A paper describes a structure:
The utility of the method is highlighted by studies with three X-ray-radiation-sensitive Fe(II)-containing model enzymes: the 2-oxoglutarate-dependent l-arginine hy­droxy­lase VioC and the DNA repair enzyme AlkB, as well as the oxidase isopenicillin N synthase (IPNS), which is involved in the biosynthesis of all penicillin and cephalosporin antibiotics. However, maintaining an anaerobic environment for di­oxy­gen-dependent enzymes has not been explored for serial room-temperature data collection at synchrotron light sources. This work describes a methodology that employs an adaptation of the ‘sheet-on-sheet’ sample mount, which is suitable for the low-dose room-temperature data collection of anaerobic samples at synchrotron light sources. As demonstrated by the lack of turnover observed with two 2OG oxygenases and IPNS, our method slows di­oxy­gen penetration to a level that enables data collection within a reasonable timeframe.
(1) VioC (Streptomyces vinaceus) is a 2OG-dependent l-arginine hy­droxy­lase that catalyses the production of (3S)-hy­droxy­arginine from l-arginine and which is involved in the biosynthesis of tuberactin antibiotics (e.g. viomycin) which have been used to treat Mycobacterium tuberculosis infections. Importantly, clear differences in the active sites of the two structures were observed, with apparently complete conversion of 2OG to succinate and carbon dioxide (not observed), and of arginine to (3S)-hydroxy­arginine in the air-exposed structure. The non-metal-ion ligating co-substrate/co-product carboxyl­ate is positioned to interact with the guanidinium group of Arg330 via a salt bridge. Binding of both the arginine substrate and the 3-hy­droxy­arginine product in VioC is characterized by interactions with Asp270 (with the substrate/product guanidino group), Ser224 and Ser156 (with the substrate/product carboxyl­ate group), and via a hydrogen bond between Glu170 (part of the 2-His-1-carboxyl­ate triad) and the α-amino group of the substrate/product. Structures of VioC in complex with arginine solved under cryo-conditions have revealed a second conformation of the substrate, which we did not observe in our structure, probably due to its lower resolution.
Residue numbers in the entry: 21 to 232, 242 to 356
Amino acid sequence: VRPWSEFRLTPAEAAAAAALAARCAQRYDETDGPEFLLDAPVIAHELPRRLRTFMARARLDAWPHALVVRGNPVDDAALGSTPVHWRTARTPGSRPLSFLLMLYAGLLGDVFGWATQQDGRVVTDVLPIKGGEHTLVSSSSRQELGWHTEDAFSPYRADYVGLLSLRNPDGVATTLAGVPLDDLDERTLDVLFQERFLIRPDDSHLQVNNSTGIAQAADRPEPVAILTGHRAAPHLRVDGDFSAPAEGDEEAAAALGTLRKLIDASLYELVLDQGDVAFIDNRRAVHGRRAFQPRYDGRDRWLKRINITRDLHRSRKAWAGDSRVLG
Ligand SMILES: NC(=[NH2+])NCCC[C@H](N)C(=O)O
Ligand SMILES: O=C(O)CCC(=O)C(=O)O
Ligand SMILES: [Fe+3]
């Protein structure tokens, strides 16, 4: 095999991890509180050793687009109905699973949120919101969520995007694609490495997607490269919807157009069943979500998600209130 690295917890490992998260949910008032934010990486050292070994070695592999952990138990009855909105989605039934995601994430890096996304929460919610079916945000449904680097507009975007599937009864697939190196000619590749492209911020950073900097990003975007790093294993920064060539740059336009078609043709599906966790490498792969028909009956697809950077100090310029919410 697969383009991702997969780990399946044994029942005993899964019980121990869940018990750990339960303990944290008893001792800490909230997942995004400063106390648990600082303690979670240390508490994570108590997770099962086989899981910690996987996370430590897999993060260092050069190939995988995602780290996938399967087999966390989720009791639908204890979980309760899927919320109608992210504002009210911190339900007691989902609380321990949110702490669990935080613990797993603490093995990979430093977690943060965005002041302009779900009220600057660190653990956020992905669920279908009635009326937002044909939008370009993660609460869409009937409209396929086009592939994208998470927060491509920003130089402080996550290195990893964590997704915990609380329920996915219809098996809706997350979509993934890597750099199509096997099909890019060297000239096209060279152009993609140059600062000849524009990236606007996606709609989830707009004021209409929050309760009661981003402006200058979609209005006066600075030219940026789509590919960086090693020619033979580039890092990727693109958004299928919000990317564009520099004004009048027909050679960059042709390179982006080619890249769109190659990623479209190489997109593959990863189904996160209930309890599955995925950490998507936001530098090697773009990700999206297949279109699906929302239910609105209380059992809709529901994910918790979290942004992870290897170095919070790389984003010092963007620290808003504290270091864990970027502006
Ligand atoms: N090309 C795009 N649709 N980009 C935006 C992706 C959705 C974004 N990850 C969100 O949480 O809403
Ligand atoms: O809907 C999914 O499975 C992924 C959503 C997504 O792209 C995100 O919020 O990072
Ligand atoms: Fe995304």
